UniProtKB/TrEMBL annotation, chain D:
HAMAP family linked: DNApol_clamp_arch
Name recorded for this polypeptide: DNA sliding clamp PCNA
Predominant subcellular localization, coarse grouping: nucleus
The keyword DNA-binding belongs to this UniProt entry's keyword annotation: yes
GO biological process, one term: leading strand elongation
Entry's localization field: Nucleus
Reported function: This protein is an auxiliary protein of DNA polymerase delta and is involved in the control of eukaryotic DNA replication by increasing the polymerase's processibility during elongation of the leading strand. Involved in DNA repair.
Family label: Belongs to the PCNA family.
Protein's gene: PCNA
UniProt-recorded Gene Ontology molecular function terms: DNA binding; DNA polymerase processivity factor activity
Source organism, top-level taxon: Eukaryota
Residues forming coiled coils: none
Amino acid sequence: SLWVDKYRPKSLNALSHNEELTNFLKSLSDQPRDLPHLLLYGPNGTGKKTRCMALLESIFGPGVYRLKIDVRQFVTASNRKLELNVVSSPYHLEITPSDMGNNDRIVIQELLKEVAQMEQVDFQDSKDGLAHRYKCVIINEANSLTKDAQAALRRTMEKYSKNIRLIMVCDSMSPIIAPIKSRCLLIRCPAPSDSEISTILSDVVTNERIQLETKDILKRIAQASNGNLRVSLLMLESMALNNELALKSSSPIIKPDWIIVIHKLTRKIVKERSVNSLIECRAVLYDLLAHCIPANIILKELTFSLLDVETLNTTNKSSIIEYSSVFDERLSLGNKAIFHLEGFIAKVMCCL
Amino acid sequence: LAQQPWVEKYRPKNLDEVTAQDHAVTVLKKTLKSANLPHMLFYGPPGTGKTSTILALTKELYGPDLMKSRILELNASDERGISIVREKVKNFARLTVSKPSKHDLENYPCPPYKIIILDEADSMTADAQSALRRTMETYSGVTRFCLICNYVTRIIDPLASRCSKFRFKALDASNAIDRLRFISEQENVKCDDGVLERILDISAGDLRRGITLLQSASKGAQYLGDGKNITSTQVEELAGVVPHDILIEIVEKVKSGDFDEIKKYVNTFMKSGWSAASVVNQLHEYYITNDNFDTNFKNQISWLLFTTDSRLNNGTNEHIQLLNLLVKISQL
Amino acid sequence: EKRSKENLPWVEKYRPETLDEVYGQNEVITTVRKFVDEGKLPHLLFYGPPGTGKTSTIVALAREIYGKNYSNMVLELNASDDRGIDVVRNQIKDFASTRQIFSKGFKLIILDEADAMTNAAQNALRRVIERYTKNTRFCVLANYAHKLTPALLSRCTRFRFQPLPQEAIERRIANVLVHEKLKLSPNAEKALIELSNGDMRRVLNVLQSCKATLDNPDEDEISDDVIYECCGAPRPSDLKAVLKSILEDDWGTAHYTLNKVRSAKGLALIDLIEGIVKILEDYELQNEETRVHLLTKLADIEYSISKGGNDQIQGSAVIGAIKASFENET
Amino acid sequence: MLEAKFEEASLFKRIIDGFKDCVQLVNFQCKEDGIIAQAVDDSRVLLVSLEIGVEAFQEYRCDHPVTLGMDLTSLSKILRCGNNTDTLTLIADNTPDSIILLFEDTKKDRIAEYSLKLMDIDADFLKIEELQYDSTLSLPSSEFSKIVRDLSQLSDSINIMITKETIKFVADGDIGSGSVIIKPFVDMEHPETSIKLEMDQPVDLTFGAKYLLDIIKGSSLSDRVGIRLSSEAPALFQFDLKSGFLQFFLAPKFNDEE
DNA sequence: CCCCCCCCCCTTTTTTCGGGGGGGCC
DNA sequence: GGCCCCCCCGGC
DNA sequence: AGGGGGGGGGG
Ligand SMILES: Nc1ncnc2c1ncn2[C@@H]1O[C@H](COP(=O)(O)OP(=O)(O)OP(O)(O)=S)[C@@H](O)[C@H]1O
Ligand SMILES: Nc1ncnc2c1ncn2[C@@H]1O[C@H](COP(=O)(O)OP(=O)(O)OP(O)(O)=S)[C@@H](O)[C@H]1O
Ligand SMILES: Nc1nc2c(ncn2[C@@H]2O[C@H](COP(=O)(O)OP(=O)(O)O)[C@@H](O)[C@H]2O)c(=O)[nH]1
Ligand SMILES: [Mg+2]
Ligand SMILES: [Mg+2]
């Protein structure tokens, strides 16, 4: 198993960063009977899901980590059979309705209400066989849900408050509607500091018997992660595997392929500004999009790589950021990602 | 009970527990003795007590026995297409009223009509909405309609004209402090002076959010086990409010005007997880209330903040929008 | 209905039963009366905005033509019912091609809210209308003319229902006061007309709310304050003060005045914007771009408000837009 | 090493058909005593228990208990192609990746033996410890069909109330309400249409149209049913086998008003 | 058989409710 | 004869 | 617009 997965903490006491958040979670779990619905928000790869699992383990027994995967069948208005992969536990449930796109609402209107409208059989840790507690449902990536699903959830989280509890994890609250925010308890999860990431990496190294001459090595990985911990662990593993389990002071930082492609696109746009260059950029964008690279991430990385060019001036950067801001909203309100990415690239090339 | 959230535990049960909606609660209470309740359209900002108000009205009108047989409630969690509206709603409206029992006729007014509550009516399609226009009018003598929405513009003009409009005002510290204080005393929560007012100000017209924040603060105080009174700094921390020091650094960086420094500071700041909406609101407050800026600067910054808020309300990336707003302000 | 008519809402309780109880449509009423008095009744297309009395007018016309037992001698189809191609092909054709049952007479079909009908049904109805014209007549009620096919429009005589005039609303208000034994101050009447915008349903709803608001209707007179409290609409004085502070006073005091006015009675920003727009529409501006900026920025703010967002930022934006637009006056 | 020569293969076909809809992956523990199985519904709301004793089988023997997670849909696929009257056997080996179903017959020509793949399904130490159930009874299945199919068209609730000398099925909905009462009725000439009922305390529990409709679809297995209702434990619907039975612990619906 | 005007014809699939048509089970 | 299911437009 | 293909005129 990968080091990023083998050393994941499984309890609130095993957390190594954001001690204030750990204390808040412990306070919440002290009396879980009256726990309101929870909404965790923060940067990606910081440990929101791990903290949610730790909170669940604090509430229920260690048995929350025995997970299974089942398949659920759904029918739309056109008699279309859709399959949903449901991750379930004896004490909690996990769902990702966004996998069904615009049909996510169905999951809200068929699955959740099925669980919240009636009780469950609990033949373990019980005398009568019926559950005497609530069930925690984790809706992963709540920001990806359509507005209709959230509107349907509005009453579901209220009329079954003491039978079902919702813990929703997201990286941004902007897509979330106001009623859902009002019905949830907001929990902010700051990204770990550089020192904490370095300490975690050092612990992994010393528990994996990896030779390291200077600790500053790990520090660089942290400056290459921009607060992300999963990226830091994966980069450490890749560097160890590429350097015969021995990191050197001259070891370079390993970047993912899509980042290199975006850098190529940026430094081709900067160097050449022509219609043929735009056609080549269209081909590059098609290649990037066809391989499961979200359009928003592509736009963000392209904008922040353009702003890092040392030849551009303040006016060019201001124009680029304004165009990026406009085209982000255009993407949010559109279907064809390239239809907006091409427009953004053309505007950037014109403004240069 | 003890196994329910404070927002649900302290949900109003009767019409006398509504705090700042007297302009409509008085009319609803008068309808009990007048028995001429018209079609109602409850609109207002989230967390003002519309569904609670209608539930309390239905209870006080019918009783726990007749509630089930006299109320039909449909919300966004049920299919409400044109076919559903034309079949199920029409059938229920055209049905005769259930016969009350002598107990109910003795202890309750028992009005001679039933109520259909279409919660979250703003999510219904225009075609489906158009099918109720004659349904409400034809069966007005046996059925009454309650449409609850957050955006009044989402309701077609004919239905708004047919329904009597009721606007629910925002719950601020000047009209909702009594309920929060009563909840605090009931839960034996000890708070410093001005803590409840700060909570209500942060809520900005949402009593549900204020109650949730109070519950979280009480849980934290109980876990601490020190007996000290709850302060405002802890409340602000629990509400995701950016510290004043960070705001001061942000405005100083904006005043510096350098693009690279602003970009680097924004990159560092976005790693803390602060919501963009709160940052924009705090910046708007600080800049508008400051007396160190001229008329033109405020004129431009107001429009810039409005545009940024409108763009953020559409579900966009917070980093790009915040960086663009700060860059634009720095060039004002 | 149940019990008596006193339990009905005022919108439905005061529904006209005869044609002489319809106000504000003297021309149309006289024309239809003359048509039904001498046998030349053509196909009718009543086009108008909500709350004008088209449905009431057609119901009264049917009652006058047929009598008390008019419900069993007419075919009334509305959006609440299913009106597809099959329905038009079978039920409407049978009704138009068949004699009466209860008593001798011609067939009447009332397609209320026909603007919500499919194009196929409208195309099918053309020959049904043009073939059974001898013994059948068609009446179509609409609020939006763009939803009706040109072929259907060509076969119907058009009658437009204008917004209710001031005098008609005053007469209806007087009748309602006489029936309900209520007293209304003249200023309250003017405010009711101003906020009515030509819809009688709004008049009835607001009057019922005001009556319910009174401590004792027997010896209490409704004033403008009562209407404003019931509807929550801003008072004209508050709007004038807010506009004055925005125009002449500085940023801080204008913001303080707006916040105080809004928090005094829990006023909503959209109503304040609408009142300011109405007030400024009569301003004799010396430049055009100032009006252009005012209109564009206020429309943008209204659109943003319609989707929600931060209210304080929206109010600050309104103030800034007004100040910037008026800066062009110089 | 293990054989379960059946008296009738149709008995096993109906046994499997009785709970194919409720669950699809169920562990079968084949001990010398017989076959035991208990599967939790994928929603963790319904427990399908089942056991067949050694008496039911024409000839059953086993040397070492073995747990097989073999599928149910494949079971139906295998058994549907068979004839009516046969003596199905379940032979296997020490390390079975498949189980050979010997469809033996008295005649030497009507043989349709097949092979069914085996699949690894995890099993837990589930417990069905008995509780002081308030009411328990048994009655035929034709009445169950005529009542459930009738009440499903009027509502989604098949609420069951069991009072002294009274058994009530209640179903209210938008169209209206429907209630059917069955009472102790014994026929000397036709004992099969009789109810054997014993209750200790009154019980009332609301149950669902889809669950009972699915259950009565599989009611062809046993001509008699078994109701067991308590006050705080999941009431169970059972179908008696030749020597065992097939139980269904179904959780009652939550009540919001009370 | 080989070459030169004069024009014609081909370069090609994904989609959110609601309604209609037309085929297949029964 | 009735469901049930699949394919196809949708502006003037 | 670019490329392939058929038919009348020259060769
Ligand atoms: N007027 C009020 N008086 C007392 N408590 C209120 C009031 N309004 C809201 N609350 C409290 O906040 C909780 C939620 O109120 P809601 O009825 O859900 O508000 P809402 O208007 O229905 O929100 P939306 O528009 O449907 S998102 C209630 O259970 C109460 O505890
Ligand atoms: N001319 C009128 N005179 C008196 N009352 C009127 C008049 N017009 C409308 N009303 C009142 O408003 C109520 C509703 O009138 P309607 O006939 O429903 O208007 P409408 O034009 O048919 O609405 P639409 O176009 O279908 S949305 C009536 O019962 C009357 O009480
Ligand atoms: N040692 C340690 N590692 C953590 C902690 N929190 C997160 N991690 C590591 O960081 C990885 C990614 O965290 P993750 O839950 O995916 O964050 P999310 O995707 O934003 O919700 C995890 O797999 C862990 O290995 C912690 O508190 N202590
Ligand atoms: Mg609500
Ligand atoms: Mg009408």
